[PDB]
Amino acid sequence: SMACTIQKAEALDGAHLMQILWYDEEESLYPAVWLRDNCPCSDCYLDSAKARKLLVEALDVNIGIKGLIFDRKKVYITWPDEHYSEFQADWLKKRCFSKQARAKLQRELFFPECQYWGSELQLPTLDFEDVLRYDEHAYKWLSTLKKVGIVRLTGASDKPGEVSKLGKRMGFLYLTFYGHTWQVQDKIDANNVAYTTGKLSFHTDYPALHHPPGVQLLHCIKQTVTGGDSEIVDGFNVCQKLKKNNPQAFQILSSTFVDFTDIGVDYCDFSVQSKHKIIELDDKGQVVRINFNNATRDTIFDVPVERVQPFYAALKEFVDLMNSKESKFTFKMNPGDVITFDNWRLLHGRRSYEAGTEISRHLEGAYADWDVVMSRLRILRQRVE
Amino acid sequence: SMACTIQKAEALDGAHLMQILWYDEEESLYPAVWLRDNCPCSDCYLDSAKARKLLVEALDVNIGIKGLIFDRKKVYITWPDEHYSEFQADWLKKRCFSKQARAKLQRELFFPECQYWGSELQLPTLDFEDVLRYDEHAYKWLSTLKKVGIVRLTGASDKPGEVSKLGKRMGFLYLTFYGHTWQVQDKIDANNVAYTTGKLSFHTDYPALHHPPGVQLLHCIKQTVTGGDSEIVDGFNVCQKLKKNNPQAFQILSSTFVDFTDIGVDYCDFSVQSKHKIIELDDKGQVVRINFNNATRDTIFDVPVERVQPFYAALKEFVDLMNSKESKFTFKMNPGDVITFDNWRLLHGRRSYEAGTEISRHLEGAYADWDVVMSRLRILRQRVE
Numbered sequence A, B: 001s002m003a004c005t006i007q008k009a010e011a012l013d014g015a016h017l018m019q020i021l022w023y024d025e026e027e028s029l030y031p032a033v034w035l036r037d038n039c040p041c042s043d044c045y046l047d048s049a050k051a052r053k054l055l056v057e058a059l060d061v062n063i064g065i066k067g068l069i070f071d072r073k074k075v076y077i078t079w080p081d082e083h084y085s086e087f088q089a090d091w092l093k094k095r096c097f098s099k100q101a102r103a104k105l106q107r108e109l110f111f112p113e114c115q116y117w118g119s120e121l122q123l124p125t126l127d128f129e130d131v132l133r134y135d136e137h138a139y140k141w142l143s144t145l146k147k148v149g150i151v152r153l154t155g156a157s158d159k160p161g162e163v164s165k166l167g168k169r170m171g172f173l174y175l176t177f178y179g180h181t182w183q184v185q186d187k188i189d190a191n192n193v194a195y196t197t198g199k200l201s202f203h204t205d206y207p208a209l210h211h212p213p214g215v216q217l218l219h220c221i222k223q224t225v226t227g228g229d230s231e232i233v234d235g236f237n238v239c240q241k242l243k244k245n246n247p248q249a250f251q252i253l254s255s256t257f258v259d260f261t262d263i264g265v266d267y268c269d270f271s272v273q274s275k276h277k278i279i280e281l282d283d284k285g286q287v288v289r290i291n292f293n294n295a296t297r298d299t300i301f302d303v304p305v306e307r308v309q310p311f312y313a314a315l316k317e318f319v320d321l322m323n324s325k326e327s328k329f330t331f332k333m334n335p336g337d338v339i340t341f342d343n344w345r346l347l348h349g350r351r352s353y354e355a356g357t358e359i360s361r362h363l364e365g366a367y368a369d370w371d372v373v374m375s376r377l378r379i380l381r382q383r384v385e
Ligand SMILES: C[N+](C)(C)NCCC(=O)O
Pocket: A178, A182, A184, A192, A194, A204, A205, A206, A207, A208, A262, A293, A296, A365
């Protein structure tokens, strides 16, 4: 295209910048040091790995272009030490340092589109076997998981092993002290409040870890009629409402380190401790993760005494908002259903049910790392486009 | 002890605080809301899980103590709604909200002691089989790993499978796209600069992931006489020197997001992207992780053009300090040697060596999560004390 065709290339700014004038009349600028650092020749770049061999030690940070020629599709550069580089037009164009170009590329890499939701949620639903068999369906699955935060898959079996198939479709699951996969059932000497018939209030899984699981997979093998309905809420949507309604409570929860703990025996013996802010913000003040399980929050609370009661007051306000009828979405899982969701963004819970002489309710769960998921999503997108 | 024996317990501050006067005359304060939240009774606390059943929804954040009695070893509290709680003296004492008590407990949980080192490093060394067989030795191993950042284990075999034994001793290894364990050897169509005979400059492993591996294990199966010596540097020590010598360069590297990438096929097919600050600080300005591999730093750099050359100038200053003869420690791995090190703190590298018609050099590596390691360290400490 005219946008990707070179009209003129020139060294500017004491030879420290290259400027490309494109055939659409737009101009791009490329620092000489960045071009040299990204030389694609075999000395500098290992093509089989698509990786940089060039060392920092080799890079003159004050380098300027010694000579430059070009045609419509490439630039050819000589360097002061006689090194020689070639750069393709389309490669340069994609990597333009303009804010618009950089932002476009970041969108393509990280899929930031987010659709916030309340009690009006239309639970995205796909077929399990279709997702396993067809790239178009697996793509819709992971893209929707990223954007909405949850997808339900229907028509799995009523036998263990289904979350493992989804894990292989992603790449691999995320092993924790509760196993490769884990069985949510009422257990004698339960090592986790999950493994009882009690109500689970809204929580994220595993804030006792530094790096809580990014994605959760939960498959219904057996369901009870006595209770055990599912509830979910969009934590990012809730945090937005909290900041607006109660900025003091938002400030406390986004700045206060809370200790989490887990001790017991499952896959192996464990004694786990972490610290997190319940509302975890990026450097720009945007919420990126919620870290909260009331069951594993430690008895240890490392704050001065005067900060304690205001913390709990803040926390109450947050949970009250999560529970509001405008925020929460309630549903019942049947055998064969699987939900896959963003464990950093949603909070989830379940209603109490009745104990029995044999197991009346059984879910099999597993976790996946967001990096594993995003990798597969990038591959799938390329395959489908 | 007199320190742990109750002399007086009293509700204060409108019944919103409990004060304990101990037999040493020291005073501790406990917020009423915190005591109620941490009731150990069977309604509030699941003993088999050592976890809180009590919901946020159940907690009156404005609660005060209705009645209190005590003896030397426990306090007995009635609440306004008629709930009833018992707290043991030793439990309360450990959880005193004084800064001194809180800081002591944080030390016991997280083992913060750090011993910075330069080229004078005396490489801590233990026997491999001793570490597998004896808790006293496994304790010294992990405690030293945490404090110094590296331990060498000698007397392993010259066969694959040794890092896997150490992984089981910790709990489990950290699976990545390069496998459960991985073979560092020269490979045709290498998917990583590591799998060549080239020099690796100082790097941390895997900044292409959001959560880079906490701990690295590297076992020498075959070594070459033609090169391939090992080099290490204490990144936390280096960052301290950089902040002192060049505060501008420190500021740039601790505030600038750098994109990292990895594309290829190994355990499965992958297309990985991340963003990190190379020098990653906590909320108090202390360095907690270094994220840097020059080979996987992307060609994509998401900064305005005017910030590019100063970034590279900063980076050069950092690498130059890492390479200084006062900072780096160089050694040669022989068959049977294993190093286990903090991949968030150290940077590591290796000298070039000569290609041959069969494999002349072979290391087997693996990763572990710091949470897995710290769990085992806590268990071991308890077993040994
Ligand atoms: C379901 N399992 C694996 C027990 N995790 C619950 C969540 C947690 O303990 O934070």
